[PDB]
Design a protein around this nucleic acid. Structure first.
Length: 1157
DNA sequence: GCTGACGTTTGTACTGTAGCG
RNA sequence: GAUGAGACGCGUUUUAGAGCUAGAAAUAGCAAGUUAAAAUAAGGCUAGUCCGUUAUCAACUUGAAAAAGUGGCACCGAGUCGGUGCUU
DNA sequence: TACAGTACAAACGTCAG
């Protein structure tokens, strides 16, 4: 007999349901394997697979980047120490070894305690002479003294490590460092985006309003009070506030519906800024870059404020003069305190937990916590005004290692490098011989297009070698094949157009992209409009359109047409038609790279077009990002009837215009057929490659894979017979004949490309037969549904969903996918070109139709299709079946058992203490002496039966125990489990009996109670409530008590509130075992029953957190908060029935673990 | 979010200890 | 909304930065403090200025692995699946 | 020889990241 499937593919679950011709689900009796006494189990063929959500590579990428950064940093040091190696070995033989084991305690350390000089006199006197490394650094710069080589090393290393940033290109000049010149460039950028309401920098001295001895807020308001055209709430004002490192609300400016807060000091500023630009435009990107550059410049004028000489180590000198300022302010504060406020001293300067100077130096407090502790203490205190104003301009008792040190360029460290090096060349000859080598060590940066410097063994790299020898800062220029590496960067980094695959996506400031998007929005008058307006200003207002042309604002812009007209300065060149592709490749070099030499090497191909000054400016220009479209989509394909391209149709289209999405979607044109012919993957792909070829989140792709697997298993069930229909939903998180048809399309048809891709995967998986001709035979037809059809079925037919009760709702939604899609496909035979891979198509389920006049019109109760004579939907019989299935108490819910993968532990390194639970950070490093990590991630648990040592008599006591293999020791456990377990103290373990138990491994124990494994030390809730349809339909309708017969349905059935509460009571006594929670709940229901039914229901809807599957989690009922009963034990599952579940969950293998021992 | 860290806060083995002249 | 490449700044951890004074003291008073080295997943071998947190994974039989293979039907009912009748 | 003194091992909240 024929059957169908429906699937509810969410980000966290895949509902699956099997339905016969009649919409009823089967219920096969499945075979059970293993040592239990149930040889079979009856299961309904409906279910949902639950799984933890597929996460992005982003955090792995961030970690990987950190790992490379640290490795290259201590190669930078190793290169330094190699250069110093022989000559240090003379000047102080053990010095680099003393610096190597500096982290060690004295018993572990082979050499002396004090790392620099060995002895306590010279090292203490180093620190007295130099309390901060910047004292040594400015000494070595200022002072031609023949200083001890150890000190040379320490300053050079404190610059080669911690070398600042590489954002300023070439040398340091006032055109890219002075706050004045840059504020001038920022106002030019503001006036470039907004030619309306500009401002003039001539009234504002950014060297003295900015960088003044006042706060961010004083300087902001002094700046506003000298701008004629602006005000502190406005756009330019918030840009300066942000530059000032304050946190403005640009949503007040762009009139955004959600809030939009920005702070340049914040570590997620890039994400927030990117959301801001998705929301406001792309034109703003050079405005915000100029404001970021201004923040870095005023940060540089604030940090570099000592100016006693131009060569005079200006960073080190300021860190010193700050130490001077800090030690006088600290002498002042301590004296102030102990003479005029004699108590409270200890909480400030000794406590070490509180946010005073104790916690600020000695403990864990940051400068902002310290300012929020100290401000309430300088307030209500006298004589302290000089300190309070230092705190107000955030200068009070600053550290030298702060969050602001990321403003420091590498040219500052190179000038101090060069000063130190060629201040001591004439005393150390190897400092002259290798000064170019050390200056390369700090200056060298691997370019963005070369990647990791692999030797074939990297997944990530593409670097191409001109020589087979070891890469270095010095030999990089010749051992890397830069050209081949950059061509490999070109070919790896180009993404591909999802509309037309295997075609490179354009740079998003491509000029063919610009002409296209302006024309697309603007849909010979077009030609006149763009030549007169869009080629003459960056953003055409509709007032200008009417005044300049209708007499005789638009989002889209030719901004790069304007940039190039500004930069290369001859207009007749950019309007010239054969000059498109030179310029397409210029914008492509210029968006692809961020390196000076690679841009210059590629622009050298064009050195004959433009003069070396504008070429210099063109290489100084830089663009970022990428569009969603390829030139073969915009201007390559062409219609076979009319004989023009998409772009030509955008330019001329007759009397009636079409948008780009219509040039794709239009039936009449041949673009859609060419696109759908091209949509397949080149030369094909595997299942896994195809899902990694889809356009979506990894969680959705995980759902798509679990969908494919539950389908392949729902045909491994019921004898390899394929389903006649598969219905898919990707979950949501008058009229003329062509308009009646458009309202059918509006109802029935998926707009989201991911689901069509799912239908393609399932189709190509299921359908594998062919004619004598090339014609496909498709044994399965794959249906894509839409949630509104389902949700209308749910809402209209009193058939409601409220997802707090149980995870059955995923399975019920897939059953709803199955019945709605399978009724639709036999109701409408001729419409299978319209959803397989009268106008309100949903009305065939209805009993009665309410018309626009108010009147009522009836339908047949049995609903049938006239094109076949087939019965399709028997109201009151299929409608009754679906209510049975939604009520039905057994639904297979499988939490996918998963090996936990991820970080070895939580990231924070905890201090040293006598606890055994600490995870050693190295193998040499005893946690009792060094500290270490905590909260290791259990990768999987393992059931071990063994002897272990017991008592002072050292008995070999036999134990069955659940041991947590952590992610760290998974590799060693899987290398040899016997010797790992023997090293864990488990003796003569039974190898054939060892049972691997990943997270969410399921056990059944008593009275049907199921409990599942979070870890060898923690368990989670298994079962869930079968509340029959009446109770769930009630509790939706009651929680939505606030059509009126639906309110009366809730004032009737009052007792269902009591019945639901006693069913959850019964159940959680049976399964949840949180007695004091049920007692609180039953007595609180007695306490609060006088609250309205609507309030009752909405609180009981939250109360199912008492029963929901998985982790115990806190919840509330009116005034009362109920805390989780955490199952931090595992002793019982050792004698439970372990269940190994199939990915659908139908097939089972059950191990009664009590039989093991 | 939710596994586990880290205390308190109870519940189990081992040695003492018992009015006496 | 996927993914990748180059740098930074901190943060943490241990160590070094002589503490002093008393006095039986489980440390009180005072003084000090700003910095640095090192490590930043353990580590791995093809030994690279690389790789190590994404994806993937119920169980059983073959297979180094890749991978393939493993569970009768229908009915009547439903507390998470229970029961009856044919069949091998 | 039953209970007392008391050194020792599971369980039960709030943090912690």
């Amino acid at each position: 007999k024929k059957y169908s499937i429906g699937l509810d593919i969410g980000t966290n679950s895949v509902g699956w349901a099997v339905i016969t011709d009649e919409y009823k689900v089967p219920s096969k009796k499945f075979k059970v394997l293993g040592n239990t006494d149930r040889h079979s189990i009856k299961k309904n063929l409906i279910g949902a697979l639950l799984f933890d959500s597929g996460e992005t590579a982003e955090r792995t990428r961030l970690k990987r980047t950190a790992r490379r950064r640290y490795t290259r940093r201590k190669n930078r040091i190793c290169y330094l120490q190699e250069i110093f190696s022989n000559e240090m070995a003379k000047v102080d033989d053990s010095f680099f070894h003393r610096l190597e084991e500096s982290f060690l305690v004295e018993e572990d350390k082979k050499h002396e305690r004090h790392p620099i000089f060995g002895n306590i006199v010279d090292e203490v006197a180093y620190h007295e002479k130099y309390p901060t490394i910047y004292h040594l650094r400015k000494k070595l710069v200022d002072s031609t003294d023949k200083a001890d080589l150890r000190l040379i090393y320490l300053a050079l290393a404190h610059m080669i490590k911690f070398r600042g940033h590489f954002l300023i290109e070439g040398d340091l000049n006032p055109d890219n460092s002075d706050v004045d010149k840059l504020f001038i460039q920022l106002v030019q950028t503001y006036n470039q985006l907004f030619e309306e309401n500009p401002i003039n920098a001539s009234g504002v001295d950014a060297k003295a309003i900015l960088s003044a001895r006042l706060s961010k807020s004083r300087r902001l308001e002094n700046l506003i009070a000298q701008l004629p055209g602006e005000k502190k709430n406005g756009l330019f004002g918030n840009l300066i506030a942000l530059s000032l490192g304050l946190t403005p609300n640009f949503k007040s400016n762009f009139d955004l519906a959600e809030d939009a807060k920005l702070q340049l000091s914040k570590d997620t500023y890039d994400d927030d800024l990117d959301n801001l630009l998705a929301q406001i435009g792309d034109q703003y990107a050079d405005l915000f870059l100029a404001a970021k550059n201004l923040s870095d410049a005023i940060l540089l004028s604030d940090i570099l404020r000592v100016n006693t000489e131009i060569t005079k180590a200006p960073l080190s000198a300021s860190m010193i003069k700050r130490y001077d300022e800090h030690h006088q302010d600290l002498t002042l504060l301590k004296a102030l305190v102990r003479q005029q406020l004699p108590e409270k001293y200890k909480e400030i300067f000794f406590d070490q937990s509180k946010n005073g100077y104790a916690g600020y130096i000695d403990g864990g407090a940051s400068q902002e916590e310290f300012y929020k502790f100290i401000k309430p203490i300088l307030e209500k205190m006298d004589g302290t005004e000089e300190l309070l104003v230092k705190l107000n301009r955030e200068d009070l008792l600053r550290k030298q290692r702060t969050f602001d040190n990321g403003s420091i360029p590498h040219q500052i460290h190179l000038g101090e490098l060069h000063a130190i090096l060629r201040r001591q060349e004439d005393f150390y000859p190897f400092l002259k011989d290798n000064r170019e080598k050390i200056e390369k060590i700090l200056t060298f940066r691997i370019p963005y297009y070369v990647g990791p410097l692999a030797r074939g063994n990297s997944r990530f790299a593409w670097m191409t070698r001109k020589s087979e020898e070891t890469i270095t800062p010095w030999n990089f220029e010749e051992v890397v094949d830069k050209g081949a590496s950059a061509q490999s960067f070109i070919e790896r980094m180009t993404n591909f157009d999802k509309n037309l695959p295997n075609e490179k996506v354009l740079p998003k400031h491509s000029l063919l992209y610009e002409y296209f998007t302006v024309y697309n929005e603007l849909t010979e008058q077009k030609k006149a409009i763009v030549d007169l307006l869009f080629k003459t200003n960056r953003k055409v207002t509709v007032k200008q359109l009417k005044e300049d042309y209708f007499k005789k604002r638009f989002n889209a812009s030719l901004g790069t047409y304007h940039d190039l007209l500004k930069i290369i300065k001859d207009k007749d060149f950019l309007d010239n038609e054969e000059n498109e592709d030179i310029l397409e490749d210029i914008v492509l070099t210029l968006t692809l790279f961020e390196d000076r030499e690679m841009i210059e090497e590629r622009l050298k191909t064009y050195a004959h077009l433009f003069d070396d000054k504008v070429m210099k400016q063109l290489k100084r220009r830089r663009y970022t990002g990428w569009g969603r479209l390829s030139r073969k989509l915009i201007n390559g394909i062409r219609d076979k009837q009319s004989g023009k391209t998409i772009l030509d149709f955008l330019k001329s289209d007759g009397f009636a215009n079409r948008n780009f999405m219509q040039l794709i979607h239009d039936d009449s044109l041949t673009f859609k057929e060419d696109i759908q012919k091209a949509q397949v993957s080149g030369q094909g792909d595997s299942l896994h490659e195809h899902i990694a070829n889809l356009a979506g989140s990894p969680a959705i792709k995980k759902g798509i894979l679990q969908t494919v697997k539950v389908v392949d298993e729902l045909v491994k069930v019921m004898g390899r017979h394929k389903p006649e229909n598969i219905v898919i939903e990707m979950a949501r998180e008058g009229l003329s004949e062509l308009d009646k048809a458009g309202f059918i399309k509006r109802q029935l048809v998926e707009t989201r490309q991911i689901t069509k891709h799912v239908a393609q995967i399932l189709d190509s998986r299921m359908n594998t037969k062919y004619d004598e001709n090339d014609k496909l035979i498709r044994e399965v037809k794959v249906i894509t549904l839409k949630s509104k059809l389902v949700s209308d079925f749910r809402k209209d037919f009193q058939f409601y969903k409220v997802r707090e009760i149980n995870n059955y709702h995923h399975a019920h939604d897939a059953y709803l996918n199955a019945v709605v899609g399978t009724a639709l496909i036999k109701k409408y035979p001729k419409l299978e070109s319209e959803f397989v891979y009268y106008s309100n198509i949903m009305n065939f389920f209805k009993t009665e139709i309410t018309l626009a006049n108010g009147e009522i019109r009836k339908r047949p109760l049995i609903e049938t299709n006239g094109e076949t004579g087939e019965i399709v939907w028997d109201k009151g019989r299929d409608f009754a079946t679906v209510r049975k299935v939604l009520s039905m108490p057994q639904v297979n819910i499988v939490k996918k058992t998963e090996v936990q993968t991820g970080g070895f532990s939580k990231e924070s390194i905890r201090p040293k203490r006598n606890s055994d639970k600490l995870i050693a950070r190295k193998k040499d490093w005893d946690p009792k002496k060094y500290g270490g990590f905590l909260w290791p991630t259990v990768a999987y648990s393992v059931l071990v039966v063994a002897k272990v040592e017991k008592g002072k008599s050292k008995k070999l006591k036999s134990v069955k125990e659940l041991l947590g293999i952590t992610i760290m020791e998974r590799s060693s456990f899987e290398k040899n489990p016997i010797d790992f377990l023997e090293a864990k103290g488990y003796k003569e373990v039974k190898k054939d009996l060892i049972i691997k138990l990943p997270k969410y491994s399921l056990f059944e124990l008593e009275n049907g109670r199921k409990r599942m494994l979070a870890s060898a030390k923690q368990l989670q809730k298994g079962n869930e409530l079968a509340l029959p349809s009446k109770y769930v339909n009630f509790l939706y309708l009651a929680s939505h008590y606030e059509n009126e017969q639906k309110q009366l349905f809730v004032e009737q059935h009052k007792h269902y509130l009591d019945e639901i509460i006693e069913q959850i009571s019964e159940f959680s006594k049976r399964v949840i075992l949180a007695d004091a929670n049920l007692d609180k709940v039953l007595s609180a229901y007695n306490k609060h029953r006088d609250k309205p039914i609507r309030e009752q229901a909405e609180n009981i809807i939250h109360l199912f957190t008492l029963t929901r599957l998985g982790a115990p989690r806190a919840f509330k009922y009116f005034d009362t908060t109920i805390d989780p009963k955490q199952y931090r034990s595992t002793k019982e599952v050792l004698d439970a029935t372990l269940i190994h579940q199939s990915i659908t969950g139908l097939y089972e293998t059950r191990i009664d673990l009590s039989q093991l021992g």
